[PDB]
Design an enzyme around this catalytic site. Structure first.
Site, PDB file in Angstrom:
ATOM      1  N   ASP A  89      49.155  15.256  48.836  1.00 23.98           N
ATOM      2  CA  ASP A  89      48.595  13.957  48.844  1.00 23.98           C
ATOM      3  C   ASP A  89      49.685  12.869  48.337  1.00 23.98           C
ATOM      4  OD1 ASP A  89      45.863  14.195  49.172  1.00 23.98           O
ATOM      5  OD2 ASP A  89      45.241  14.088  47.172  1.00 23.98           O
ATOM      6  N   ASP A 124      38.335  18.253  54.012  1.00 22.37           N
ATOM      7  CA  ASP A 124      38.851  18.076  52.751  1.00 22.37           C
ATOM      8  C   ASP A 124      37.951  18.958  51.568  1.00 22.37           C
ATOM      9  OD1 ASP A 124      40.524  17.297  50.822  1.00 22.37           O
ATOM     10  OD2 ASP A 124      40.237  15.352  50.964  1.00 22.37           O
TER      11      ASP A 124
END
Lengths: 716, 716, 464
Positions: A539, A477
């Site tokens: 997301d 990430d």
């Protein structure tokens, strides 16, 4: 024989594509003759234009590698400040080499292949007055109608030169109406399709964040106004780069259109001392005469065979459970195995432990500390991380008979919290500009990847971590962009650093399933995909918004490349409630299907066990199949995609109804990509000819607010 | 196997088209399943729609012969006021018959064909409560993907009934976005393409002139919004009828779209006595998956092979000189011979003497007298017409060796001036309503062709005229519409009378070339093309505007059908001046090329003789070729059209530049309809492969306000 | 001075609107000069058009009451079938009268107002060849920039004539670019706005249901393409009618746009005997130079003060609770008072009992029986209706100090179930055509309100 040279004429031929240009023997410049459907033999030559006004001949020609400062007022492909202070450049044609295969790219990701699949043509230019050499590569992958371009600038003179702008690819289009397509968005709304008519002047987009970003993807399509998903001509351009980019389409005064993509010129002031070379990232281009969908399908196959190098490119992805949305930071050892037990009992094959497991003196128990201290938290994992991972990788998987769970970890190696041991020891390692305030975003700073101390730090903590336990999956990430930079050179140096880290680590651990992520699709580009077979698409995990997000992402990247997880409702980003079967079905269009929710909060253990089995059934067609977007979510409330197997023998139709459709007819969904004269059985029942399924199609009604269907077809 | 019946399911199958409907054995109604590209085998049946509110199941189905008054609130195909005074109708399926070939249509023009080319299905409906029968005819010409429909209403009761509305064709489309194309205009600007999106509600057009008219043609196309001249799906509809008409497209509340063409209801109140039958005109329907242009090409080949019955459908038309715009009404024997001599010296093979030759007591020296008295005027032709026709037809034609000039003549039989002898004797022969004022348009009234007396008056004076001299060409004009009528029945009885007349006279003189006319294209419809092989396209003879008019007319009708004359400048309708070669190149796209000016006013004889030979050279390809409208005048200032021999050996390209193009790139015109792998010699010089001419194209530059090129292609 | 007559010129002036037409003294026809923002004084006259082809001068002028069959090929406002069979009509100006106020419309609903609010001009036309008369009514409400139009047709001859088409209002617009706006939908999605460019040819919408319907509303707006809710010019048209209707806009070949609203010509074959008259419903029409919303606000003020005649036009409505979606058919006395108590407890001041209270031998316990039998169901209301309504109207409302619950009830008077006493007694009261099947929708037939027996049945059981 994809490449034919005749004099100073160069033709690159694919199956249904031709790219033709020549060096002008008088000016030394490279002129474009044609980029589009197949041509062969003698080409018509354009009649010479009449010159009046300020725009001389050089402004009325289709130029392959155009410069500014000698008569062309259109946007240049290159700007060089010479040692003596001029921003002039007269790079003329000197010669060329043809080479089967495709040479690598130094420090940058690039498509690959051997001599059967790809041929390369290198054209050497030289500026006599300033001693600058340019080297234009062209590669054809003929089966996919793909032209791959890149450029090298080398300083041959005695002083420094600065490259102020350098496009990976510059094409001049003839005079004709064009539409421009791209993907624009932000966090939790990536990859929304926009389409606009090309006007006189400049239009385009780019990224200033230092990464390719959520705001615009480094990708765009030029098409005719009448071009649809299945008909007409479309040209696609995709920059193979994870840093900043600039894409500009200019309709010039004379009617010709210049398209160009490459480095962001405001983040590229690359000083080249004597002998030094600057290499641009590669730009993949695909022509299709079968519509925009036809262009995507060639991108998908090209990237699956010749760019994604991981062994998972055509393997099937294990259904996974990610702990993030289910538990966030509030957990430890016991929660992680209660999560892993419950996961295994649903049939899930990989359990991923997300954010929150690391740090010691400043533990990662929230947004606000610990990034940089990459050892397990002893408050949370008192015996170490390896006794936890061993117990987890012996949980047997429900409905499988045999296989044991897999385990995966989350990391975010390019980032550091001021509140950490790392920053207290090495505060000079982050990106900053002198005394300028070191602005945080999500309470973190960006480690400076242009430093070799930084790169080795990452290579190290990652190597030690992956060798401590049985970890077969890493989510990588990256949760902010760049702000202050020590210098403009650092944008590109950072990426050469990041690529050194990704090349090293992915080659040291080829059996790890690596997933890119950057607050979702913040670095969803072909640069990352070279090293990682899949990327967290967004997301936003709400079923409705993901339909748009995934249809937009698929415009350039294969569905096998997209992660998608079934989440809990009400959704944490939209507050929307949507039915479980509808959420699950939207997630099966992703290559890596999974669950992102506490396995106890789900009430119907059979329904989710049924859905996981359905997910594993559709996965081979999503990984290896050909995507046919039948109805776009931007065109109507009934989007629909069809996945046809490579060989034509199976297919799966995803059909959705987004709004409610009260007291109204429903449309028909017509299929494509089938054999008109073959028979297909639909969901094990009725059998239809291909022509019928494609020319009349199917029709579904629903009496709910949301509806979805997943339908299987078997040839014959 | 072009028509296929399984149970109550009827399927009509062309080469790349299919039309499928079925009878519901519960309600007796005919329901459409599919009209589009080929289907075969079993078809998916739509899920049953949930019914809510006032719209019952009848309002939610696709119907083939929809009535109103039993639950369907959509526009109907039929309306019958029964003897007892209801406007209810319940025509239920009774049976059917399939036969090979196509029956004639009583008293009306229709397409015709033999057992191989066409197969016909008649479906029988009957209303038990009112004793009314309806017989629906469907014919397939499979080679042209054409479906020809027509309907019969027979009164089987014991009182009268009134047909208040009867559509020839009635198709219901599934829910999908559609675009409607029509041709609109007026005098001197007929056949302008219009394209609009189909909206909830009614849109359409028709005619109330009593003829098909300049205002709207009895023709329209439904297309997807993305459909172009060469991509996507189009459905065409053409009414084979010269009278009033009504065309309507209705997107109903539920979202299905109804399209219907036939009689103008407002001029149809047709009383049917016990045992009488009303026969609608045929409507010809074409489907294409290769764009609007593919649709046109099938129409063109169908009409040239199965509608235009004259022996000239495939024969080339002689370059002619019409005397109207050169001399108008001011001439005598002396001038007509002057025009004929200059005609043959230029190479013109046919000389037409337009208005102004007739009348005796009331001479046709102006707009104001003599229509009706169809004997030559002794003031202007002292020794009669036959000696002048005699001297004219002995003039040899330049550059020909052998052939002598032909003579043709203008007539307007359906009309009469009040200042004439015929009107003084038979004032009751005209259309009129009791004592209402007899309104004039261009000082004339219309003869009532519903009266057999008036029919035989026309048949007889034309038979006598054509036998009185050497006349091999007749231009049949018609310079106003119907105003007052003695009854609504007379609208369609006039047309049945005109068709008896046109049928007699054209069968009686098969070697005359007959040209229809009505102040230009005021009666430009398939009804007239059945008897006449060509029609005067428009009174606008201006080069620039004839490109829009000829391009629009070719949407439905083959260029072989279109008369087009090089005219004098400044143009008498526009006042615009266009160079002579531009004007000629535009006329050469008409099947019948000619001059319409005083040849005394043109001073470059070698240029004119050079353009007439070019016209003769391209005329075969215009008559027998396939048209590809490469670039539309609506889309750009560079319209272009391509005529390809039916067998691919040859092609001719017309390419125009209308506006000036100041200091700007010219576009590339790309051809189509060639063999990609064949070689073509362009204008005797360079040789390009079909794929090159189609995917790259040719570029033409001009330094003039108007420019034009006629370019020939030979295969190898 | 809202209406000004000068010779054969007629001008209707409002606060911000003008409507100007005149009588052609050669042809007798009414020609429109201006309909739009205020004008005054001399008007520029249009230079005479050049005539070529088939469309003569009648096809090139803006006409107030256009007929077909004498040279005009545009869609007409009137079609008349003469006794002698002709469908021709030559209506010529005869005279006019202006009166303050506005007269009533026979049998129909209409706007109303006193001499200060509205002025009316009536124009008389006569066809001497067939003996037919027309009367065109024009009413200005100057404060609302509204023009209200209606037309009479009188048979003045000795035989029958048939009105085959008759628009309430027909305006001809000059050559401009126009957008057309309307409301479309169906059950559970009424009145979705729609906006399309006006094209050559015909476009419009109507209703064939016998009622104005869910599918299109008898209302449309013409406006410039750049007109929004607050900028630009807009013309609204509203038909004051509940039956079927037709709305047609047509851009003629010459570029003039004709707008016409009224009866549905497919459901209008109106035979007039000697001396008989047919009156068209009125069409309210509003001009605004201040956007589409300017026009709406003018309709809203006009309707509330000059159309809605009930005393509740300006009065506050009591918050109510309707029992339909909460209980549907499944109830009796007991649930109806549980609902009424709980309503008063919440501050609701009016309680409505919806469908399902009526019928006896065939009770309304579903969609399938009872409509037509308008007495309370004894199974559900043992002692009748009035003991319950008296308990219900005696509940006190919460937070009101004083007020009592009010009671309301649901009826469907124009319908009947085949499964009912009414249908068994009077099966010929329903709309039907001879022996054609009596098709049902929601298991009901429609009563024939053209029959005086049906109207009195309705008036009496409602009164009772």
């Amino acid at each position: 024989n994809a490449i034919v040279v005749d004099g100073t004429t160069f033709a690159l031929h694919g199956a249904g594509m031709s790219y033709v240009f020549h060096a002008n023997t008088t000016t030394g410049d490279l002129i474009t003759d044609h980029y589009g459907a197949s041509v062969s033999g003698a080409l018509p030559s354009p009649p010479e234009p009449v010159v009046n006004g300020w725009v001389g001949m050089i402004g009325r020609t289709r130029r392959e590698f155009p410069d500014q400062g000698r008569g062309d007022f259109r946007i240049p492909a290159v700007r060089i400040r010479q040692t003596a202070g001029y921003a002039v450049s007269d790079l003329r044609y000197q010669g060329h080499e043809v080479r089967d295969g495709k040479p690598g790219l130094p420090g940058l990701p690039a498509t690959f292949g051997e001599a059967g699949d790809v041929t390369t043509l290198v054209v050497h230019l030289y500026d006599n007055h300033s001693a600058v050499a340019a080297d234009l590569s062209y590669s054809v992958f003929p089966e996919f109608d793909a032209v791959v371009r890149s450029v090298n600038i080398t300083n041959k003179g005695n002083g420094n030169i600065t490259i102020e702008h350098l496009a990976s690819m510059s094409v001049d289009f003839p005079f004709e109406d064009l539409d421009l397509l791209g993907l624009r968005g932000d966090w939790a709304r990536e990859a929304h399709r926009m389409r606009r008519r090309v006007e006189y002047g400049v239009q385009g987009f780019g990224s200033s964040t230092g990464y390719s970003s959520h705001l615009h993807n480094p990708f765009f399509v030029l098409a005719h106004p009448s071009t649809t998903e299945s008909q007409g001509e479309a040209w696609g351009f995709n920059l193979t780069y994870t840093g900043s980019f600039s894409a500009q389409v200019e309709k010039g005064s004379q009617g010709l259109t210049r398209a160009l993509i490459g480095f962001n010129p405001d983040q590229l002031s690359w000083t080249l001392g004597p002998g030094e070379t600057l290499t641009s990232p590669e730009c993949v281009s695909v022509y299709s005469s079968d519509g925009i969908g036809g262009m995507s399908r060639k991108f998908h196959r090209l990237y699956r065979k010749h760019l994604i190098r991981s062994k998972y490119a055509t393997l099937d992805r294990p259904p996974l459970l990610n702990s993030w949305e289910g538990v966030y930071f509030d957990y430890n050892q016991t929660g992680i195995e209660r999560l892993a037990r419950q996961s295994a009992a649903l049939g899930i094959r990989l359990f991923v432990m997300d954010d929150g497991w690391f740090g010691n003196k400043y533990p990662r128990t929230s947004d606000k500390a610990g990034l940089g201290d990459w050892t397990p938290n002893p408050d949370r994992f008192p015996d170490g991380l390896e006794p936890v991972v061993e117990r987890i990788t012996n949980l047997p998987v429900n409905g499988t008979a045999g296989e044991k769970l897999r385990f995966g970890i989350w990391v975010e190696p390019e980032m550091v919290n001021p509140n950490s041991s790392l920053y207290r020891e090495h505060p000079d390692w982050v990106l900053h500009a002198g005394s300028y305030p070191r602005t945080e975003r999500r309470n973190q700073l960006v480690l400076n990847l242009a430093l070799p101390e930084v790169q080795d730090f990452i290579i190290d903590f990652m190597t030690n971590l992956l060798n401590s336990a049985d970890i077969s999956y890493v989510k990588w990430d990256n949760n902010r962009g760049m702000h202050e930079m020590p210098s403009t050179r650092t944008y590109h140096e950072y990426m050469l650093g990041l690529y050194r880290v990704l090349d090293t680590l992915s080659a040291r651990f080829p059996d790890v399933l690596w997933e890119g992520c950057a607050s979702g699709g913040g670095r969803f580009d072909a640069g990352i995909l070279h090293y990682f077979p899949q990327i967290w698409t967004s997301d936003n995990t709400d079923g409705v918004d993901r339909i748009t997000i995934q249809f937009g992402t698929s415009l350039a990247y294969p569905p096998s490349t997209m992660g998608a997880h079934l989440s809990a409702v009400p959704n944490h980003q939209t507050s929307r409630t949507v039915p479980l079967e509808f959420r699950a079905h939207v997630a099966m269009m992703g290559g890596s299907f999974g669950l992102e929710l506490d396995p106890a909060t789900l009430q119907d253990d059979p329904e989710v066990r049924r859905l996981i089995k359905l997910a594993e059934k559709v996965n081979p067609l999503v990984i290896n199949g050909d995507l046919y977007r039948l109805r776009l979510p931007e065109e109507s409330q009934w989007p629909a995609a069809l996945f046809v197997a490579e060989d034509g023998s199976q297919a799966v139709l995803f059909y959705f109804q987004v709004g409610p459709n009260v007291n109204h007819a429903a449309p028909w969904v017509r299929l494509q990509g089938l054999d008109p004269e073959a028979r297909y059985t639909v969901d094990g029942n009725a059998t239809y000819k291909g022509a019928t399924l494609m020319n009349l199609g199917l029709q579904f009604t629903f009496d709910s607010e949301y509806g979805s269907k997943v339908v299987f077809l078997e040839k014959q």
